[PDB]
Structure 1
Amino acid sequence: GPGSDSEQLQRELKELALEEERLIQELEDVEKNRKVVAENLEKVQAEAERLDQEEAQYQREYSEFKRQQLELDDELKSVENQMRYAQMQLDKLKK
């Protein structure tokens, strides 16, 4: 019994050792892979946060141009209205 039982245990230990070796390598490599994915995730989240501020700036710019456009068009209506009035005064003097 004991001799054959010992040979079976020796075979089991050799199988375990080979798997141990493999796992140790796989753990070294997963650690490298996790470092890359952590970098990638941070970079994309940092970029998204930056783009949010860019978008906020453009929305302010857009709103400002829109306001300017309304202000200018109203100034133009005033000029046009003043010119008609002046011409009407001139028309009275031209006669």
Structure 2
Amino acid sequence: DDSEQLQMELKELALEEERLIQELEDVEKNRKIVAENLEKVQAEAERLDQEEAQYQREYSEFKRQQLELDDELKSVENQMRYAQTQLDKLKLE
């Protein structure tokens, strides 16, 4: 009866082995898929980093332009106030 028990056990184990092999193949498949997805999102994130860097540079540049133009406008305003003061004095004689 020993031999029959061993034969049955070997058939049971062969079924379990096949189950595990198919599980392993499934996990490997899914792993490759997820790795590809990781590669994709990482590349995407680098491109986004560069896009953000460009916008940040543009934003900072516009702020500096605002500062410069404000200074220029203040200058023009002062020049107008001065010219108008002189003109008013001349007109009043």
TM-score by length of 1: 0.89
Please report how far the alpha carbon of residue 11 of structure 1 lies from its aligned counterpart in structure 2 after TM superposition. Answer: 1.2
What's the CA shift for 1:27? Answer: 2.1
Shift of 1:59: 1.1
What percent of counterpart residues are identical?
95
Aligned length: 92
Where has structure 1 moved over 3 Å in runs of 4 or more? none
Q: Kindly state the Cα deviation for residue 22 of structure 1 after the two structures are TM-superposed.
A: 1.1
Unaligned runs of 5+ in 2: none
Query: Aligned match of 1:49 in 46, 49, 54?
Result: 46
Q: Distance in 1 between matches of 2:22 and 2:12?
A: 16
User: How far has the Cα of 1:80 moved from its partner?
Assistant: 0.3
Partners of 1:74 and 1:56 in 2: CA distance: 28
Q: Distance in 2 between matches of 1:6 and 1:77?
A: 105
For structure 1, which runs of at least 5 residues remain unmatched after alignment? none
Query: Deviations 1:16-62 (Å, cap 9, x if unpaired)?
Result: 10011112221221221011100111111111111111111111111
Work out the CA distance in 1 between the residues paired with 2:18 and 2:40.
34
Of 43-52 and 60-69, the range deviating more from structure 2: 43-52
Q: Return the alpha-carbon distance in structure 2 between the equivalents of residues 13 and 41 of structure 1.
A: 41
The alignment yields a C-alpha RMSD, in angstroms, of 1.1
Give the 3-state SS of the residue equivalent to 1:45 in structure 2: helix
- Larger deviation, residues 22-31 vs 57-66: 22-31
